[PDB]
């Protein structure tokens, strides 16, 4: 009965549906009746062309604002270089209109789509906070294809107002269920960047999304880290197809690329999922992504099976999003229990790093207390350390179930002598594991240089629950 879209470029949207199974399985969700109706997505970027032929029918002024100029109208600033095309391309991936003879279709082609014009100017902490906290009882899902510089040297995250916006959003947004923040994991692959040095992607309040090429490979721009949750298709080499979306000046493009394209596709899939169950909390959504994402046919050299039998990669998280499986699992989903937080101060004295440091600690994860965790969600190793050349460090964290998370890989361009100041390295790779037992932190000098430094604080922060486990995969 379901008739797929007839838009002229829909046949070029290989990542939405194909016979090849190299797709996001979105048509299967459409055929179950989920196309985004009633869900509101906002693109936090350089503006949205609200009169675009393939966006106008879905555009939502209530999902939109211009923070750069402080007015309601997020229209991009037109320039000769077309610099401000980026948000319009992201918007079409989410919610381009279907069956209208124009371009292709959004993942959630009946969702309402808005944009916050906030990148076209100085992006201050207050700018980010006003964008992340925009209309949080109207907007369901925020999509951000931007972040700190991908030079492979920067360690940067949200400052106070932005961090407050994340916490207010997941606590009080969406009627108390929590705003959904979707983040692009980054374009710093060529610089050997790590998305754990990015506090937006590294945050537990964002779903950080990585990219795969059409042929199932790790793209040149991809950043590996333990905080990534899942993956959607994006661009690769010039023999691989790219992303089809709305472009500036009312055009259609078939050459949208990079990490920027992956987050909007995830945001669309999450919109379909919210339509299938509007009562999902922000943590529910991350559970669904973990349980339904698909490693198969994604190539990586670091696939590992965690303690509950799920395959996980630092390039891909739990793998490709599967929209059909998301909306199917969402329908009868039982809300997860309230989030518990167990804070474990590991060190009794500072430790010289030297060539290599290993810190072992057996934990009870708040046994006997209301924050006892037997089912891990996110885990953080909040580290304070000094070191003479930060990019020579590699840091690994091993869970009691034996899951080795790379918190930090070598960054050849990171010459900083600033160390880390209570930086909350995050891993998703031990999701649903029991965190009781021996944790191991490994810090090593990956260069031949005589480096030196001291680890002065290691707080292991565990989030999760104590009920509801599934039989391991």
């Amino acid at each position: 009965v379901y008739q797929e879209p007839t838009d002229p470029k829909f046949p070029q949207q290989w990542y939405l549906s194909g016979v090849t199974q190299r797709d996001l399985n979105v048509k299967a969700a459409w055929a179950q009746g989920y196309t985004g109706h009633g869900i509101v997505v906002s693109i936090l970027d350089d503006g949205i062309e609200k009169n675009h032929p393939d966006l106008a029918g879905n555009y939502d002024p209530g999902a939109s604002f211009d923070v750069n100029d402080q007015d309601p109208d997020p229209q991009p600033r037109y320039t000769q270089m077309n610099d401000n095309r980026h948000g319009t391309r992201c918007a079409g991936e989410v919610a381009a209109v279907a069956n209208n003879g124009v371009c292709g279709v959004g993942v959630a082609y009946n969702a309402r789509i808005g944009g916050v014009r906030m990148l076209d100017g100085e992006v201050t902490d207050a700018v980010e906070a006003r964008s992340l906290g925009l209309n949080p009882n109207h907007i369901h899902i925020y999509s951000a294809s931007w972040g700190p510089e991908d030079d492979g040297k920067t360690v940067d995250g949200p400052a106070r107002l932005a961090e407050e916006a994340f916490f207010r959003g997941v606590s009080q947004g969406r009627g108390g269920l929590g705003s959904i923040f979707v983040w692009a994991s980054g374009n710093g692959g060529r610089e050997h960047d790590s998305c754990n040095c990015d506090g937006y992607t590294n945050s537990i309040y964002t779903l950080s999304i990585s990219s795969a090429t059409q042929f199932g490979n790790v793209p040149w721009y991809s950043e590996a880290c333990s905080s990534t949750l899942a993956t959607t298709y994006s661009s690769g080499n010039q023999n691989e197809k790219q992303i089809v979306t709305t472009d500036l000046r009312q055009k259609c493009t078939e050459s949208h690329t990079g990490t920027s394209a992956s987050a909007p596709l995830a945001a669309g899939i999450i919109a379909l999922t919210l339509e299938a169950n509007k009562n999902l909390t922000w943590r529910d959504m991350q559970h669904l992504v973990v349980q339904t994402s698909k490693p198969a046919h994604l190539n990586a050299n670091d696939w590992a099976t965690n303690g509950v039998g799920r395959k996980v990669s630092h390039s891909y998280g739990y793998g490709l999003l599967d929209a059909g499986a998301m909306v199917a699992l969402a329908q009868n989903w039982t809300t997860v229990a309230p989030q518990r937080k167990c804070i474990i101060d590991i060190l009794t004295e500072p430790k010289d790093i030297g060539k290599r440091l290993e810190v072992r600690k057996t934990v009870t994860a708040c046994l006997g207390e209301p924050n006892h965790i037997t089912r891990l969600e996110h885990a953080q190793a909040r580290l304070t350390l000094s070191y003479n050349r930060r990019g020579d460090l590699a840091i690994h964290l091993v869970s009691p179930m034996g899951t080795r998370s790379t918190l930090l890989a070598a960054r050849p361009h990171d010459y900083s002598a600033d160390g880390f100041n209570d930086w909350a390295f995050m891993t998703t790779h031990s999701w649903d594991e029991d965190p009781s037992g021996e944790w191991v932190l490994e810090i090593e000098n990956t260069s031949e240089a005589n480096n030196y430094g001291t680890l002065t604080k290691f707080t292991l922060v565990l989030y999760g629950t104590a009920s509801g486990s599934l039989v391991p995969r």
Binding site: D45, H86, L119, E128, W146, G147, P148, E149, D150, D156
Partner: peptide
């Protein structure tokens, strides 16, 4: 900072 912040980059697209």
């Amino acid at each position: 900072x912040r980059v697209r």
